[PDB]
Design a protein around this ligand. Structure first.
Ligand code: HEM
Ligand code: HEM
Ligand code: HEM
Ligand code: HEM
Lengths: 146, 140, 140, 146
């Protein structure tokens, strides 16, 4: 997908401020809490009975770290998200059979986490840039369904 | 089905938003138009640039509808009936678009209420906005 | 909100399906598994090959739930409450999947009732299935 | 998207029996009737107040003919739906701003029309083949959003 230079700017600048050890876990947790059917794929994670259990669950934080890893990679290759996500697409589509609508949901959750963490700095134009990004990632991740 | 805890969460967020509600409504609209440009087709007679007095005025209307839903959360279908007719019959609003606006509303709250936007309240708000959206798309 | 005309349309289609309902339920399931293979994940202990006695038996259950919804169309939330709990709490069924099954149910009716599947009845059935789906996803 | 030879077979064989002057209009009509917000894009078509008005509307039938034309074209180029639909994608996305979810809906409506018209011949495996097809068309038509 194609971001303008002003959008690439808006995106990369904010992303440099992201705590890569935290935000992934924060987004994965909210996904599990806000869209509970997603918990279906994470039963091995243990206690997920309450929001506090989810967010303080050490497996959630550790696995979230990997998830953000991929988003970071995608940010690194905006003009080739398809190649970047080929392997993850095989995993999520052919192996796990996750419905691709949840790729969109996780992207939107991440956006809410960024908004929360950056507040006023997460302006409407900055969000718009990020929306192109998470949409591009969901589409690439869903390639094996297409 | 909103739980008793959802109701208190939403009420609490609403309360904290306070008199910014109208202004946050306008902001949610702007975020929607910029992030999801297809939605702009529904407002062809609106100027949608930053600072538009029309978007400001309309955001208050939107906020006002939402607070009315909050204040009558145990009978949203009745409270929002006139608005559901408008959105389905007259405007013919695509159901997908309610998800887009609901997301922008969450983002806006999140960008303004750091203490309140916990995972739990986030969940409660999303459910609240999905219920409002269900009502507003119930009349096609 | 189902209209009086929607109610009679659905009732009429239901009536014409008659005692095939269970068999058509099984068929809708099969069409779902084949067309949308992701849905199969929810039935890992089922054999889903053609002629499966399990899919047959389950299709009757599904059909039975739908006829119960038809027979209590003015209070679906109450009639389907136990089933909505099951689908949300215990099974954790992804909301997208209700659209997939609803489509397969329409296809099945269409492939069996040439006289009844008019554009109007098609509309009424789709609304009926969307309302059932709304109820079954109301409990997360 | 990739159909098996058995699926290509299932698809092309049925499609040869399709009335190309009728089915397009039948599907467009149902789209307008079942998903009334779509009428938003077709106000110039005149009377759409009732299902009978929609289905007997001569503009609906004529424009439906073109719509099926494109599906036929897509059936002709399964392994390159993206190139086939480039122009239509610009039109539907950049010009008209139709939400791509309605591309999926029209495809599903077409599937219901085929089921109706072919009955028992429209078997679960045949439908599955067609589902890959309409999904491929919706994805290609939505390329300009991606
Ligand atoms: C933008 C969307 C997504 C991204 C970028 C993403 C990224 C990742 C990454 C990087 C991994 C680790 C891969 C590895 O261990 O080598 C992973 C694993 C996993 N993901 Fe996701 N994911 C996404 C969406 C989802 C969603 C929505 C679900 C479920 C609702 C899901 C379910 C899983 C599961 C169950 C695993 C563990 C697989 C295993 O280790 O066997 N993913 N994902
Ligand atoms: C949370 C969901 C929504 C709420 C609470 C809401 C609220 C409102 C309210 C209060 C009005 C003014 C009503 C009146 O004057 O009687 C309105 C009008 C309108 N809404 Fe919404 N709305 C929602 C979703 C949407 C969406 C998703 C769209 C389109 C993408 C939309 C498009 C419009 C349009 C085009 C008007 C008329 C504006 C005009 O011509 O003045 N609404 N809405
Ligand atoms: C029109 C919507 C639906 C209806 C009317 C329906 C109906 C039913 C009924 C009557 C049962 C048995 C209930 C009982 O034994 O107490 C059942 C169970 C079940 N349903 Fe559904 N269902 C619907 C949608 C779905 C969807 C979309 C999925 C997944 C894609 C699904 C997956 C399941 C599963 C996994 C079971 C349990 C099967 C077992 O382990 O025996 N259902 N459903
Ligand atoms: C698989 C999905 C679709 C296909 C294959 C398709 C195909 C076509 C074709 C072949 C045309 C005529 C192009 C021409 O005149 O050169 C057209 C025009 C048009 N379509 Fe579609 N269409 C699809 C979905 C939709 C949907 C869902 C909507 C609205 C809800 C829509 C709205 C329109 C409108 C308003 C025109 C007239 C444009 C004009 O002449 O200015 N399309 N489409």
């Amino acid at each position: 997908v194609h971001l303008t230079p002003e959008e690439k700017s808006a995106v990369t600048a904010l992303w440099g401020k992201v705590n890569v050890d935290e935000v992934g876990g924060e987004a994965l947790g909210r996904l599990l809490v806000v869209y509970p059917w997603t918990q279906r794929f994470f039963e091995s994670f243990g206690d997920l009975s309450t929001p506090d259990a989810v967010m303080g669950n050490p497996k959630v934080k550790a696995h979230g770290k990997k998830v953000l890893g991929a988003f970071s990679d995608g940010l690194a290759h905006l003009d080739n998200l398809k190649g970047t996500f080929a392997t993850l697409s095989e995993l999520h589509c052919d192996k796990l059979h996750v419905d691709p609508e949840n790729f969109r949901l996780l992207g939107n959750v991440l956006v809410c986490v960024l908004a929360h963490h950056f507040g006023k700095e997460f302006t409407p134009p900055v969000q718009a840039a990020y929306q192109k990004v998470v949409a591009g990632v969901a589409n690439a991740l869903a390639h094996k369904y297409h | 089905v909103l739980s008793p805890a959802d109701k208190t969460n939403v009420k609490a967020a609403w309360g904290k938003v306070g008199a910014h509600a109208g202004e946050y409504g306008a902001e949610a609209l702007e975020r929607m138009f910029l992030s999801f440009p297809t939605t702009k087709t529904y407002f062809p007679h609106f100027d949608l640039s930053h600072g538009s007095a029309q978007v400001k005025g309309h955001g208050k209307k939107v906020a006002d509808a939402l607070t009315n839903a909050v204040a009558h959360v145990d009978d949203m279908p009745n409270a929002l009936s006139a608005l559901s007719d408008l959105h389905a019959h007259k405007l013919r609003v695509d159901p997908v678009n309610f998800k887009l606006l609901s997301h922008c509303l969450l983002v806006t709250l999140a960008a303004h209420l750091p203490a309140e936007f916990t995972p739990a309240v986030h969940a409660s708000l999303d459910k609240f906005l999905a219920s409002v959206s269900t009502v507003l798309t119930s009349k096609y």
